Design a protein around this ligand. Structure first.
Ligand SMILES: NS(=O)(=O)c1cccc(Nc2nccc(Nc3c(Cl)ccc4c3OCO4)n2)c1
Ligand SMILES: [Mg+2]
Ligand SMILES: [Mg+2]
Ligand SMILES: [Mg+2]
Ligand SMILES: [Mg+2]
Length: 274
């Protein structure tokens, strides 16, 4: 959906993306009430390939409609700067948000965040979309703490293309995906276990200071991340389920959502901690 630039007001620069600024603004279109939007801008000096890659995120977002997937409002393509407008997520990226708020949300709140992410992923999997970069940094959080999946793009990773999309995010990536480049919803479930860990640790770095090769070797040698401090054992177990080496043994996302829904219904179960 092409948006008349007269309908957009940019208020403030709030971040930086791959190709430019991320801004907060207002969208007001005839017959609709004004709303808050995030706006990515692309200014002068990029190649047409770069323009296409930038706008591809909009094309992909626009294929989806789900409360846990970032909503596209529209694009500005007949004018400079080129823009992508989405719903505005007041609290930004989940990893940074949790680090700011370390120890300040309850286990039940954290599980609700995890449930929203898992519902987004359930939907993407149903739509046969493999995310491939599922990480807390790619989860955006609104004022009501609703978590939504972001970062959409279909470009192959640099390792997949010519001998001579960016690099595979090793610490989030399932071993078979690293080894063979087979990305599936089941490799996303692995990544989701890593997101669970990031959430229950209030945004700590998966595998701390381990190198990417250290991580690859550790996982092959049966190492798995330990329960974060105060983490309910049942959540750690679901993490371990996501991190099975055999991808077919991992839970699919409907199962992940169910498990989380049970926990919310049965909060006493969350009291068991190592
Ligand atoms: N807490 S804060 O107000 O300082 C802040 C900072 C950065 C981003 C925020 N929300 C924020 N909300 C929605 C989206 C977004 N970034 C973004 C992505 Cl990830 C993809 C595509 C796109 C985007 O903006 C429009 O087009 N960001 C909020
Ligand atoms: Mg991606
Ligand atoms: Mg990415
Ligand atoms: Mg990317
Ligand atoms: Mg801590």
């Amino acid at each position: 959906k092409e948006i008349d630039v007269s309908y957009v007001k940019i208020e403030e620069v709030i971040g930086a993306g791959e190709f430019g600024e991320v801004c907060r603004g207002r969208l007001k279109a005839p017959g609709k009430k004004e709303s808050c939007v995030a706006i990515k801008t692309l200014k002068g000096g990029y190649t047409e390939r770069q323009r296409r890659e930038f706008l591809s995120e909009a094309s992909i977002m626009g294929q989806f409609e789900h409360p846990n997937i970032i909503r596209l409002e529209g694009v500005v393509t007949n004018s400079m700067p080129v823009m992508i407008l989405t719903e505005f997520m007041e609290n930004g990226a989940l990893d940074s948000f949790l680090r700011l708020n370390d120890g300040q949300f309850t286990v039940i709140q954290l599980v609700g965040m995890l449930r929203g992410i898992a519902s987004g992923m359930r939907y993407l999997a149903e739509m046969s979309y493999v995310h491939r970069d599922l990480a807390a940094r790619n989860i955006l959080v609104n004022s009501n703490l609703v978590c939504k999946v972001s970062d959409f793009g279909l470009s192959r990773f640099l390792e997949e293309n010519s001998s001579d999309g960016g690099k595979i995010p090793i610490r989030w990536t399932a071993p078979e995906a690293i080894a063979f480049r087979k990305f599936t919803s089941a490799s996303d479930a692995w990544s989701y276990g890593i997101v669970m860990w990031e959430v229950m640790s209030f945004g700590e770095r998966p595998y701390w200071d381990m190198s990417n090769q250290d991580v690859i070797n550790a996982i092959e040698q049966d190492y798995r991340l330990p329960p974060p401090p105060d983490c309910p054992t049942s959540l750690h177990q679901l993490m371990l389920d996501c991190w099975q080496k055999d991808r077919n043994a991992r839970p699919r996302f409907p199962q992940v959502v169910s498990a989380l829904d049970k926990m919310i219904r049965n909060p006493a179960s969350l009291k068991i901690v190592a």
